[PDB]
Amino acid sequence: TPVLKVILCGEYGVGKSSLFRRFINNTFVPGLDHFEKLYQVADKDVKLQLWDTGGMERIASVTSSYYKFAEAAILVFSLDNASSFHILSQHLLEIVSYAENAKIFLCGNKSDLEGDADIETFCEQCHNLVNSTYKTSCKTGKGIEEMFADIALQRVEANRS
Ligand SMILES: Nc1nc2c(ncn2[C@@H]2O[C@H](COP(=O)(O)OP(=O)(O)O)[C@@H](O)[C@H]2O)c(=O)[nH]1
Numbered sequence: 001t002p003v004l005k006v007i008l009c010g011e012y013g014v015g016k017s018s019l020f021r022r023f024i025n026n027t028f029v030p031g032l033d034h035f036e037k038l039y040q041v042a043d044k045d046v047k048l049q050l051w052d053t054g055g056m057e058r059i060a061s062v063t064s065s066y067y068k069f070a071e072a073a074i075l076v077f078s079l080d081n082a083s084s085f086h087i088l089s090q091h092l093l094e095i096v097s098y099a100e101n102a103k104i105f106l107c108g109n110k111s112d113l114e115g116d117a118d119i120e121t122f123c124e125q126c127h128n129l130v131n132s133t134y135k136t137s138c139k140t141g142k143g144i145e146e147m148f149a150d151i152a153l154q155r156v157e158a159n160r161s
């Protein structure tokens, strides 16, 4: 079964490590850089290899090997902080530079602390670079399992086409 690499991108403090923890175990706490999980979508089984930055985005020392050979990139931003959504342009630039033809997904984390703005992605990038957007909350787990399931489904469908 194929192994598809999914990287977590975004600024420091949006909830990338919390999403990574939720992936490994459905846990929230107020290890390794990558974790593999097996999904079956219809006929095809795929192993999603989710990567976390390891806190290296705090010193802006995310190496180019983090983006290389990435089948997908999840741009995570906090729904209560509008700067985290504005700063995604640099991360998308690095992704495209080191891994073109990569599926870009958008994650709006901390949906329990928004009630800020960022209600419209407003075509952050064109030519349908964004495959789909998601609103998650690592504290309550809302929309996380659905997000990863839909990501696996979309990339199985894309690799079959
Ligand atoms: N309420 C709420 N808090 C969150 C959520 N995700 C993360 N946090 C909080 O944000 C803090 C830092 O998040 P962190 O995992 O370090 O994000 P990262 O460093 O960007 O990967 C943690 O202490 C969490 O308690 C969420 O979905 N909802």
Ligand SMILES: [Mg+2]
Pocket: 016, 017, 018, 054, 055
């Ligand atoms: Mg982190």
Ligand SMILES: [Mg+2]
Pocket: 056, 057, 060, 061, 062
């Ligand atoms: Mg970085």
Ligand SMILES: [Mg+2]
Pocket: 083, 084
């Ligand atoms: Mg800031």
